[PDB]
Amino acid sequence: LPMLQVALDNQTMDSAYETTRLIAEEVDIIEVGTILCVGEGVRAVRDLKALYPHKIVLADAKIADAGKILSRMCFEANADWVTVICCADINTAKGALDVAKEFNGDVQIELTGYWTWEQAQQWRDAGIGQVVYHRSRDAQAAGVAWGEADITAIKRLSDMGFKVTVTGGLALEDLPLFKGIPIHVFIAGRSIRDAASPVEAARQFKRSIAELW
């Protein structure tokens, strides 16, 4: 079954705790959004893991360069997974993975923005086993919706051997679109953080997921 991941795109830790104190036990993965990494620094990862050690903590650092330096900082802060932006040099993705192996963590390729299938092949050959298919937030606000092109690419990535995470302003009604595909993880940020009842929002995703998968 696809796991449920909550994106913490808050600017301060106290803001993030308003959400985790409610749904921490309702999700599988607690992500330190890029906005939180830049707002508080890597201490966000260290503090959240200390609070929820039984959960998977993802540092959405979107590493672009200095792969072994930035990943080591996240894993030393106890992160389980870290993200590497899709346009990073292949040596950058490789370095982060090498470090991740030292901590028994893992690396994800953030497919935010422009990327190609040739790069996708390179990531496989490098040994990367996870990708995050992301519909850009700025793109969404510009009227961009989910479509067949996305479904097709997602299926293709899956056929390549990647464990695929789908994210990007996902609402409970968007789940049916991905039925049939073995999605590894579904990410929900605003739809859970900003719902009237975050707990009900989280449980409904879980419910819908178990029902469709």
Ligand X SMILES: O=C(O)[C@@H](O)[C@@H](O)[C@H](O)[C@@H](O)COP(=O)(O)O
Active site residues: 34-35, 62, 65-66, 70, 110, 134, 137
The least CB distance from residue 157 to ligand X, in Å, is 16
Helices within 52-168 (DSSP H only) = 67-76, 90-102, 117-126, 137-141, 148-159
CA–CA distances in Å: residue 7 to residues 28, 35, 45, 149, 194: 11, 10, 13, 24, 11
Q: Is 137 in the site for ligand X (CB under 6 A)?
A: yes
The least CB distance from residue 40 to ligand X, in Å, is 14
The least CB distance from residue 80 to its own copies, in Å, is 17
Residue type, 139: A
Sign of CA dihedral 107, 172, 156, 152: negative
In the shown chain, the binding pattern of residues 173 to 202 toward ligand X, with x for contact by CB under 6 A and - for none, equals --------------xxxxx-----------
In the shown chain, the binding pattern of residues 144 to 173 toward ligand X, with x for contact by CB under 6 A and - for none, equals -----------------------xxxx---
Nearer to its own copies, 49 or 206 (CB): 49
- In this structure, what token pair is assigned to residue 20? 């985790």
Nearer to its own copies, 88 or 107 (CB): 88
CA distance 170 to 147: 13
